[PDB]
Amino acid sequence: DIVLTQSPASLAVSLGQRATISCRASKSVSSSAYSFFHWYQQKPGQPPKLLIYLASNLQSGVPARFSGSGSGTDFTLNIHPVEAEDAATYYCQHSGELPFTFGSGTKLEIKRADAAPTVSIFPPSSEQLTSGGASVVCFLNNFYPKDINVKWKIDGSERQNGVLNSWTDQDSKDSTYSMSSTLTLTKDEYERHNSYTCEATHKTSTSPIVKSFNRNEC
């Protein structure tokens, strides 16, 4: 097998700056060979899109800012200038002798100005309550960088048990991330406590951004 080693696994670049993604191949045997390279861009919920064919030739439709190069085993993808829509994962591929193989993948973080999360808490729905369970949801939207932390507080106490978190892929238009945290208690213990805090620590702020709700406002 021609086994492709991609590097880096991830990098972060500013709008307009240069991005370089490398791909290595082990060499194979027979003179009856003829093997080629190709690069693919894959965005969030989408099939990968062919960018460059045979190492260095450009594809119809993809902008002048994608270029490829390389000799023998070493191959490179260049993105300059980098634009917000380039936030994706990139794969190299080999096409000659079977099997066709893909590289490990390389994720492009678009580096962009620091930005605070817009956070919002939500009490459990009256409907879920009807069936013995209670979920309290917190939204920490449109922040940068990806790094964030959410602390749940039930009255004056910290609560780590039924906490479920979820992150979006970097946004394609602005370059932000969003997170969602769901604390899932039973109805019984939702009812025997009153104060509900969603506490968000992030780079943009020295003190935790706090949203709360008291159970006494239906």
């Binding site: 990968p48 099997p99 729905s125 939204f139």
Partner: protein, 222 residues
């Protein structure tokens, strides 16, 4: 123009089988080699196999891990591509893709993907719950609302707001898998003068269980 429309994906029990289809249109199908590729949730792309042209006797080739279990198949006169996968495994859980072999053994056009889940867990409809701000919350020019889709299997679901009319400040978060059940969430942010004033509804769909729920987001009261 050139199109590949995929269908067939769904939950299957381990050791079971499934046939995926890939509907082609916009090019002379009978000339091109076709390919399947898989991609497990949160992982890389892996080659499955190729089926060649009429002129190459419909020759087929597979990545070894599926050598004796998978069959790639072709209907020239109707422009259809098939992948029947026998004796399925937990590891076979993935998004599956068909593609057209373009310029240099490269893959020019790709189908949109179809999810195949292999597990013994049972197919379960979701409970769509509203996320309304707490009654005694102060204003801030804009309000955020949401939906919680909890206790469902398998993926996918689709979430839209007002049938598609709100596509702007939407954040539909990837599902997370607790005890053989997925939990999803979706947030919508609107100008605070178009709610409660105006209608905001989330449209959830879970094709596996034939679920079609809508949820108006209501103010909150005693």
């Amino acid at each position: 123009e050139v199109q590949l429309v995929q269908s067939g994906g769904g939950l299957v029990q381990p050791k079971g089988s499934l046939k995926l289809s890939c509907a082609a249109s916009g090019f002379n199908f009978n000339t091109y080699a076709m390919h399947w590729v898989r991609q497990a949730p949160g992982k890389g792309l892996e080659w499955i196999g190729r089926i060649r042209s009429k002129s190459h006797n419909y020759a087929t080739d597979y990545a070894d891990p599926v050598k004796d279990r998978f069959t790639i198949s072709r209907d020239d006169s109707q422009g259809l591509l098939y992948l029947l996968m026998n004796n399925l495994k937990t590891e076979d859980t993935a998004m599956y893709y068909c593609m057209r072999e373009g310029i240099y053994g490269s893959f020019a056009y790709w189908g949109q993907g179809t999810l195949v889940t292999v597990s013994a867990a049972k197919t379960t409809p979701p409970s769509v719950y509203p996320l309304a701000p707490g009654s005694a919350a102060q204003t801030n020019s804009m309000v955020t609302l949401g939906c919680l889709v909890k206790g469902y299997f398998p993926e996918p679901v689709t979430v839209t707001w007002n049938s598609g009319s709100l596509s702007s400040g939407v954040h539909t978060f990837p599902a997370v898998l607790q005890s053989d059940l997925y939990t999803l969430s979706s947030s919508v942010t609107v100008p605070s003068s178009t709610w409660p004033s105006e209608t905001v509804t989330c449209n959830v769909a879970h094709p596996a269980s034939s679920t079609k729920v809508d949820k108006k987001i209501v103010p909150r009261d005693c």
